[PDB]
Design an enzyme around this catalytic site. Structure first.
Site, mmCIF file in Angstrom:
data_model
loop_
_atom_site.group_PDB
_atom_site.id
_atom_site.type_symbol
_atom_site.label_atom_id
_atom_site.label_comp_id
_atom_site.label_asym_id
_atom_site.label_seq_id
_atom_site.Cartn_x
_atom_site.Cartn_y
_atom_site.Cartn_z
ATOM 1 N N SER A 1 -4.341 3.671 -3.851
ATOM 2 C CA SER A 1 -4.275 2.427 -3.105
ATOM 3 C C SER A 1 -3.001 2.371 -2.273
ATOM 4 O O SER A 1 -1.974 2.933 -2.629
ATOM 5 C CB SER A 1 -4.356 1.250 -4.021
ATOM 6 N N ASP B 1 -2.394 3.038 -9.422
ATOM 7 C CA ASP B 1 -3.406 2.672 -8.445
ATOM 8 C C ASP B 1 -4.262 3.881 -8.086
ATOM 9 O O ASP B 1 -4.957 3.851 -7.072
ATOM 10 C CB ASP B 1 -2.768 2.092 -7.185
HETATM 11 MG MG LIG Z 1 0.126 3.147 -3.799
#
Ligand SMILES: [Mg+2]
Length: 172
Positions: A39, A81
């Site tokens: 992410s 993430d």
């Molecule tokens: Mg990241």
């Protein structure tokens, strides 16, 4: 085991599956793909908006990734993430690109937070094909891992295929 937050398997699982799938894909002379997913702007989110928000984003990302797979594909959560995705069997590299493109586009939609506010982020995706790039779990994983790094560094929110001169691009 599957992590309590997202219900997704861990690397240990992912590696075995990939191993089994590689042995298999070799046998029928077929193709598979590994996607490494990270992410964007995650730390910023937790800093500016806090754990709960982060977790929400993780759960969403996880849901949206699986939203784009087929019953045959696999998502594991590496940690943080970051997620690993096994695309087996595969008709073509094209297919892998296409799926990646859809996972990416999935993120055009904002994510509802617990207070009813909304965050938008990106994923960065490195892709490593079998057998074009590598023919061992470790190698394939590594290649995807690196492709992702290169992708985050070149332009966040994009998907990038592992190339054969990737270690030279990493060195420069
Ligand atoms: Mg990241």
């Amino acid at each position: 085991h599957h992590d309590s937050l997202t219900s997704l398997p861990n690397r240990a699982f992912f590696e075995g599956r990939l191993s089994r799938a590689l042995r298999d894909a070799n046998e029928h002379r077929e193709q598979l793909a590994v996607l490494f997913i990270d992410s964007d702007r995650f730390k910023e989110i937790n800093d500016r908006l806090g754990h709960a928000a982060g977790d929400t984003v993780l759960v969403n990302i996880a849901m949206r990734i699986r939203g784009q797979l087929r019953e045959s594909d696999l998502v594991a959560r590496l940690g943080g993430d970051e997620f690993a995705v096994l695309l087996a069997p595969l008709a073509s590299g094209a297919d892998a690109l296409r799926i990646a493109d859809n996972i990416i586009a999935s993120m055009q939609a904002p994510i509802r937070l617990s207070d009813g506010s909304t965050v938008s982020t990106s994923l960065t995706i490195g892709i490593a094909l079998y057998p074009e790039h590598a023919d061992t779990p470790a190698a394939l994983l590594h290649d995807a891992d690196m492709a992702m790094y290169i992708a985050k560094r070149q332009a966040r929110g994009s998907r990038r295929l592992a190339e054969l001169n990737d270690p030279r691009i990493l060195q420069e």
